[PDB]
Amino acid sequence: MVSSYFKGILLNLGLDEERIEVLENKGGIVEDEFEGMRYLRLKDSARSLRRGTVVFDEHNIILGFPHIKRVVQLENGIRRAFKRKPFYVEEKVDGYNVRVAKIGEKILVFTRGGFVCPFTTERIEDFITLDFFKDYPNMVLCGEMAGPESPYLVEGPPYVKEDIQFFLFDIQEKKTGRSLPVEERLKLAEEYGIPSVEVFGLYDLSRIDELHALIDRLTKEKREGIVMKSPDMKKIVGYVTPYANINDIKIGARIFFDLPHGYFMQRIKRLAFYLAERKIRGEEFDEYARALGKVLLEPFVESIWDISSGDDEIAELFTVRVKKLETAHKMVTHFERLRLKIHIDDIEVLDNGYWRITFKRVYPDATKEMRELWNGHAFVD
């Protein structure tokens, strides 16, 4: 299942031989390959080695991201996490996270599960100077890839009007995964001109009313929310806008089936706690209730009508821009290896010489369940 080359590295990191065998047999560790370079992916956590960790050799170990906790009640979430101590407040940007690292002579870009993204790996030179990795070869740039032409999302921040952008939110050490303190990370982003998430400033519990006002502005601006970080990066909590919760449901309800457990319920919960904390009542409350009902039902009913004839599969269209047509071929191979059903729908050359690729992503499992129910399949609750 997994080479003794990689199991030897795990042994030297202190994993037990029995744990390695269980991980190997259960598919918790798997081998992958990018441009001929073999590496190990952690599909499950292995003690200190978080899910999404990748191992190329004894030194080139890129730790997966911790799961960052969210609060649904902002004022008490702050009181619990930070008491009255100060914390940085940054934008939560709605994209996909990436880790950028120098591996051998190559700059590689990893998505959350530890896959090398051929698209982002080709594009990352458009956003980050490679000087950073000449000076800090053992550091990992951590950021959100976000915009309207994304390979993995169909939404994004309003201020990215075309293509896609990188937004730094952390700088971590290889092997240990240790985060730089906020201030040092921000100094490095300045020094190397690395685009950053917006840092709104330094706040504390006493400024809760300014933070509510910020959330209200972000909601009207169709932005995702905030991430709250102690200066030493040891305490991190996120809080998202009602816009983010409502729009997530709208996008998801087109598919409905085969989504992460609790996808819709969690966002209904976050909406209810926002309405409760902000004391929203009267007509304003009614507009949220109407919006929630609309985004749950309208996209879902439309897909039912789509599938009800019997030909089509539920689908999402998206576009990306690539420098080389060869990258588009590599993404098709990459999607096929990820067990996604995605094909090229259109291609256009742009006036700057980039290729704009339109992909169509279809959802056969959600389609099957939706169609079986339409066709009268009977099931127990």
Tokens matching residue 58: 């004894």
Of 68 and 338, which CB lies nearer to its own copies in the complex structure?
68
What is the C-alpha separation between 55 and 62, in angstroms, rounded? 7
Tell me how far, at minimum, the Cβ of 186 lies from its own copies, in Å: 24
Tell me the CB-side half-sphere exposure of residue 187, using CA atoms within 13 A.
5
Q: How many CB atoms lie under 10 A from the CB of residue 203? A: 19
Of 231 and 238, which CB lies nearer to Mg ion in the complex structure?
238
Q: Does 248 bind Mg ion (CB under 5 A)?
A: yes
x-marked contacts with Mg ion along 78-117 as a string, rule CB under 5 A? ----------------x-----------------------
Tell me how far, at minimum, the Cβ of 248 lies from Mg ion, in Å: 4
Tell me how far, at minimum, the Cβ of 257 lies from its own copies, in Å: 9
Q: Does 78 bind its own copies (CB under 8 A)?
A: yes
| Partner from Mg ion, its own copies, none contacting 156, C-beta within 5 to 8 A by type | none
Give the type of residue at 93.
V
Could you identify the residue written with the tokens 């919760």? Answer: 245
Q: Does 293 bind its own copies (CB under 8 A)?
A: yes
| Partner from Mg ion, its own copies, none contacting 381, C-beta within 5 to 8 A by type | its own copies
| Partner from Mg ion, its own copies, none contacting 353, C-beta within 5 to 8 A by type | none
| Partner from its own copies, Mg ion, none contacting 351, C-beta within 5 to 8 A by type | none
Q: Does 71 bind its own copies (CB under 8 A)?
A: yes
What is the C-alpha separation between 61 and 261, in angstroms, rounded? 30
Q: How would DSSP label each residue in 19-87?
A: HHHHHHHHTSEEEEEETTEEEEEESS-BTTB-TT-EESSSS-EEPPPP--EE-SSHHHHHHHHHTTS-E
Of 12 and 380, which CB lies nearer to its own copies in the complex structure?
380
Among 22, 153, 208, 275, binds its own copies (CB under 8 A): 275
- Positive or negative CA dihedral for 219, 220, 223, 226? negative
Q: How many CB atoms lie under 10 A from the CB of residue 65? A: 17
Tell me the CB-side half-sphere exposure of residue 263, using CA atoms within 13 A.
16
Q: Does 291 bind its own copies (CB under 8 A)?
A: yes
* Residues sharing a CB contact under 8 Å with residue 135, sequence separation 6 or more, in sequence order: none
What is the C-alpha separation between 51 and 361, in angstroms, rounded? 26
Of 9 and 227, which CB lies nearer to its own copies in the complex structure?
227
| Partner from Mg ion, its own copies, none contacting 248, C-beta within 5 to 8 A by type | Mg ion
Tell me how far, at minimum, the Cβ of 93 lies from Mg ion, in Å: 8
Do β-strands 69-70 and 236-240 pair in parallel, antiparallel, or remain unpaired? parallel
Q: How many CB atoms lie under 10 A from the CB of residue 19? A: 14
Q: Does 70 bind its own copies (CB under 8 A)?
A: yes
| Partner from its own copies, Mg ion, none contacting 188, C-beta within 5 to 8 A by type | none
